Amino acid sequence: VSPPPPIADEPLTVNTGIYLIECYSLDDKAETFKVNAFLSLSWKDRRLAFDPVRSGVRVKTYEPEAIWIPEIRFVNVENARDADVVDISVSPDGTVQYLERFSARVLSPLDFRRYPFDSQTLHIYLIVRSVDTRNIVLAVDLEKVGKNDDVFLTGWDIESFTAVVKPANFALEDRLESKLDYQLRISRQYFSYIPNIILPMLFILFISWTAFWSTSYEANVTLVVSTLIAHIAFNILVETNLPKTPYMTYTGAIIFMIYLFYFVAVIEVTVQHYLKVESQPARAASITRASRIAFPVVFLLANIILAFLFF
Amino acid sequence: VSPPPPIADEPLTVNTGIYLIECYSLDDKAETFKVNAFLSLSWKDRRLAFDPVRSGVRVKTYEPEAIWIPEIRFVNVENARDADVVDISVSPDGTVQYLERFSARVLSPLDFRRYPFDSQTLHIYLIVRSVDTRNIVLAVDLEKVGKNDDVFLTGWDIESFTAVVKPANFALEDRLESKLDYQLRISRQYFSYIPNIILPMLFILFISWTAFWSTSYEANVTLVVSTLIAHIAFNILVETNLPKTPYMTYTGAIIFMIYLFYFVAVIEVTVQHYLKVESQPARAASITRASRIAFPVVFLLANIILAFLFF
Amino acid sequence: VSPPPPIADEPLTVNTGIYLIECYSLDDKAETFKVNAFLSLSWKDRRLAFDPVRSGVRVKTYEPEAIWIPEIRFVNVENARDADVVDISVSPDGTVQYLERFSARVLSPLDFRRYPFDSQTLHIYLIVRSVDTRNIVLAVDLEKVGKNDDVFLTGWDIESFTAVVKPANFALEDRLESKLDYQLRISRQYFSYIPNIILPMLFILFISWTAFWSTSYEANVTLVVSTLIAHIAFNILVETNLPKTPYMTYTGAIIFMIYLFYFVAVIEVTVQHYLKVESQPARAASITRASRIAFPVVFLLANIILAFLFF
Amino acid sequence: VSPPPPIADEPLTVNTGIYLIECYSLDDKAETFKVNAFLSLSWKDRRLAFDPVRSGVRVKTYEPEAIWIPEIRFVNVENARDADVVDISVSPDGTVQYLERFSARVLSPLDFRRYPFDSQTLHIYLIVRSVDTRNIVLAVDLEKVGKNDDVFLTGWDIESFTAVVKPANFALEDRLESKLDYQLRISRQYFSYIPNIILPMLFILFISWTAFWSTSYEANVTLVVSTLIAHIAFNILVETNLPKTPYMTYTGAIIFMIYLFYFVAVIEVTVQHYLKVESQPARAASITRASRIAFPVVFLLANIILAFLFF
Amino acid sequence: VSPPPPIADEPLTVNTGIYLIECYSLDDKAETFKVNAFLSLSWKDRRLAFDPVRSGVRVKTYEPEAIWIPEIRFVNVENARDADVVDISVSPDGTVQYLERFSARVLSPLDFRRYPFDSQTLHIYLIVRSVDTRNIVLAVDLEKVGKNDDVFLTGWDIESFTAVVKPANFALEDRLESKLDYQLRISRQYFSYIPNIILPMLFILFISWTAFWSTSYEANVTLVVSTLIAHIAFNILVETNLPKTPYMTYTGAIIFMIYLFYFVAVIEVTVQHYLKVESQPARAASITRASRIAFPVVFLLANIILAFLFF
Ligand SMILES: [Cl-]
Ligand SMILES: [Cl-]
Ligand SMILES: [Cl-]
């Protein structure tokens, strides 16, 4: 075959809809996710039209390579989609109803600034290249767009699956291409991170601060440096969950700022000990007593400085 | 082709059965598992019926694309099934017997609340979309549903493979779809976890508690902080076996509660030492002697508080 | 096509043979292994028989989908086999010679009780489903079963590749199925494990025992707890080589028993120190001197208790 | 089919262009990256030419296996490309316009000398083998070469995608082959590495240096050796991001040089302690006080020695 | 089709050549590597021969399934090769020129005795099975065997790609098979390993030896045991780069021998301390002073004992 000829000089509207049956494998590091969904297309090809009265049953089915079907292709995917054709129904008036079920690996970027309290807007871009004999445009059949009540993306809640109704079209290598935008919004399930990363990472920090109620370098070094080792256990665990962002993550800031509250603690401790060899135990254990508040304070300030700075 | 015409105005019962030949790769983190099984279908298409007497042999075989075969598709899979067709036998009266062997990667969620003492109900959902010319319904051929005596899902015992006989059917994008539910129940083999995770994780905790029979900060810090390091070895090992649940796991609770019995131990130790610089060795080593029971008690209580809270 | 009609009322013998060209990727954790082998089949279909004298060359070749070929399928595989057809030769008398080379991922379980001193019996099960018009049986063409002198399964020696000549056949969903059993026996190359896991894991234990010739808690805690950290390095390395068995592995026992000889060492040390604060340096360093033999003894006993218990 | 016959004795120019739709998965260790792009070809086959006036619409479409299409193949790929054919338009004068969209895994080496401040020149080599009946040459259709404003290669900025216009051609196994060179230049997003690797790796080093303001071996050993442990945490993390280069990386130098500033620190410390048993506390704590500047100096020198040496 | 009939009673020589376009992914652990190469075949089938003077152009091209092409198959591969056919040219005299480009994952074992200073001989074995009607033999077209100036196998230098000209042929399941042997020799790029594994692993050892210039058990235990921890960091990193060999690696020996120079160091230290409690500070610090040379000596001896033993 080859396309429907234009009765006027109009371009052909093709009526698209994506209905999600599964979302799975949101891979943060990779900035991807797998989807499994119906893709539903719908266009007018009068060449196929017919008389219901004489022909018998209302609507006519075709095997795929019988009729002309538009080159609808996903933009932002790695795996060029794996699809079964489900039904092709042609209505009396030459209007076609195409349905495939597909699954593909989509490549939408994620913004980690607010990790692990972030939300995202995933993107499934649909395209169609316009042929020789006529232009083609896509548009949204808002009733053939949805998702399942099953659909669970482990570690995220799912807000909306909507579609930007207006396809911005444009010239790509001499011909026109029409591009739609489907939008899956999600919010990270942050609960996990409290008792798995934050509360522990804090306890091991707080332990470090017990060297303010001690005056034994021999022991304080152990206190602070050992807990720094323990903290390092949890920096290398968090920084490889995520990709190398060229912008600062919020968790990453918190974590990096902690590397001072160890560094500076060592300084205080190293000083308190210094002065006590230099015999000013008054001035030494002024500092050390100060710290007992300075540290918890400057922390609760500076986490609130950051909190605001990031939200 | 195209479907059997409805003699009355009835829908079309299709007679389904899944017989498991292999279950494997239950992936906890992914919330998936691979299955390899016969799918057996069975429907009435009178167009194919015949006279055995004037025939040859009793029953007639067809190559797949010869006859009309219903669009039976798995719902909750990532890999749209890999299938070889095994036999299509048509009985004299137009009743078809379809058999394929398939294997697919199924995506059923697991509830980790009781890990690693949990059990699960896996789900293989079968669907069929209803065509223009008539509706289609599924139902269970209870004699064509089973599993092998071979079948072993490493790290789980397998209870039942049954099927919810009544398919709840419903409207999806204008047409009807009929959905069955096959149910594989399993229970985790928890033995591994005793001598691999729990008993060790306890010994390293108990060691921490030897700092109640000591009065040497210089050493006690080492005792408690080192064992905390060792414990951290086993938190990062358990917390990446599993997915990030937004609900509290039972193992996760135990583990998180342990991070206090290190934190609080440090407090006690830090205090006992504090008081000894402030000269109340009586009051100091009252506490220290108390702890010798307080800790083991509050633990056996609070593990039994949790145990109950989770079971 | 459809099968050879039975001249008597006999079932059809199909003459099977597997010749291994490669075994590779024995995956302990997965309980699998990849094989790459000739599958050779051989049956009598008189419909194909012919006159050599008049027809020309002695034996006739056919492209696969020309003749009737039996549905031979592997039972215990994940990847339903990838096969090239190599030759189909039909002898004058209607006897067919089928040869494919295949490769597949086989799923045979392994028994780890004796790891890493274990041996295994891998299993490649061949099946054939019996048709409508006649029954089918498999049997072994003992001269078409072997393996290469190349074949190396890294980390295992390979004993035998034999086949249980008698196929136990049986009824599966109304029809007969005939199942053969091919058996690849292997023994683990345990040498690696001596200087990589056992000898080191022992040295770090023996170091722990230097705290019996010391009377400095400050230091002994360090000695024992540090070496316990080092030992933990090698428990988490061994326990993820293997799958979670619900039965006790021999290596796992040894390892778990070691977690006492650290625990109990801490006890002794914690005691020796205790008594020295309570002023019985005699009784304290009686124990400590006892231990110097108690420990190495109770170890050589209890590894020999286990050794016998497991062999 | 078979090629266009040469009107003169000229070779055939084929007009190539690659338009990148996605770059992703730059795998440093593997020295690869996945691309997804239009490949656009364009040649003159007069056999296909026609009269527009009589034939109807201006330009003629063909299904792929209808016409002769040149054997264009990618050189430096692992996955021999996955391609859909998009359009084949033949202009009146026998000039063909071929368009496929492809995606492939490209194998271009990366130079890590300046990691993680490096830039790279990726390479997509296009080839065509020349046939019996005539020679074939490639050349660049500079207007059909570009990339998207979407295209993001996580962790890199993308400079240019250009093409070396002149294909160097040559004899390979008796016949000619013509090879083009497309060039994707990129620069690593180094920001991530400051607060994730460098600043921490420095703090843990600076802590080591607090043992110059201390005179307690018992503690200094702890200070220096513990921080060396912490540093080892970050050497094994960096050295497995990257491949085993046979040339010195810049990060690797820095890191390896740090292993001296621990080694030499131990020496100083071990000495200061030695002398203090030998009773020259003057000479001992001359050294120690010297070091307080020697170390930070020799570091700022030697990082600047290297910095220059590498840039 | 079916083969060329033998004019005499000779077997058919088939003229093979492999030209490497890419080698990549030498996987030490797996004992594999991916190759991407031309396979070029060449045989005499007179049935295809012709008269150039009357037929027109010198040489005739055929689509693959037109002519008889020999069953050439790779022996030692996991992935049964992925191939495009490039050209089939038939010369006037019935001699065929076949060319495919293929890529496959080859399974050649590597000998790790001398790791990481080893070299290897990779193996790509070509086979052909001999038919009913006549025998087939392979042989090398030495001018159609080579490699690219591009070809880079990251972490190895590439010496030669040659072919054992004489195919040893043999009987496999009743018929003859002819097997060629192509040989890719490579040498490991060992530079990486000096500043990444050996020099550090030595510094951490040398630090251990600073406990000979100290007489503080409290501290020496820390010195030696901590550095043993640090060394363990680098044993578990080296021992999982490589497969479990049943023979001793050279790196593995060095590493295992190091586990004594920690063990024995502990002994010395544990002794020096013992004697100081038993009051022979002379005899104690005789040993300690001896060691200061004993250790570095016995090391430079015993690494040279081994060096020789392995080379
Ligand atoms: Cl697509
Ligand atoms: Cl499906
Ligand atoms: Cl290609």
Residue numbers in the entry:
A (entry chain E), B (entry chain A), C (entry chain B), D (entry chain D), E (entry chain C): 5 to 315
Wording from the paper:
Fast synaptic transmission throughout the central and peripheral nervous system is mediated by pentameric ligand-gated ion channels (pLGICs), also referred to as Cys-loop receptors. Here, we show in electrophysiological recordings that desensitization in GLIC, a prokaryotic pH-gated pLGIC, is enhanced in the presence of DHA. GLIC has previously been crystallized in its resting (closed) and putative open states, however, the desensitized state of the channel has been structurally elusive.
To better understand the mechanism of DHA action and to attempt trapping GLIC in a desensitized conformation, co-crystals of GLIC were grown in the presence of 50 μM of DHA under acidic conditions, similar to those previously reported for GLIC wt. (A) A side-view of the GLIC-pH4-DHA structure at pH 4.0 solved to 3.25 Å resolution with a bound DHA molecule shown in stick representation. Well-defined electron density was found for DHA in all the subunits in a pocket at the channel periphery; lined by M4, the M2-M3 linker, and the β6-β7 loop. The DHA molecule appears bent with a twisted/curled orientation, and makes a salt-bridge interaction with an arginine sidechain (Arg118) in the β6-β7 loop. However, it must be noted that the density for the DHA tail is not resolved beyond C13, and therefore was not built in the model. The R118A mutant showed robust pH-induced currents in oocytes, however in comparison to GLIC wt, the current decay was much less affected by 50 μM DHA. In this new M2 conformation, the pore is funnel-shaped with the hydrophobic extracellular-end (Ala13′ to Thr20′) wide-open to a pore radius greater than 5 Å, reminiscent of the GLIC-pH4 structure, while the polar intracellular-half (between Ile9′ and Thr2′) is constricted to 2.5 Å, resembling the GLIC-pH7 closed structure. In contrast, the GLIC-pH4-DHA structure shows a distinctly different hydration profile at the intracellular half of the pore, with loss of densities for water and ions.
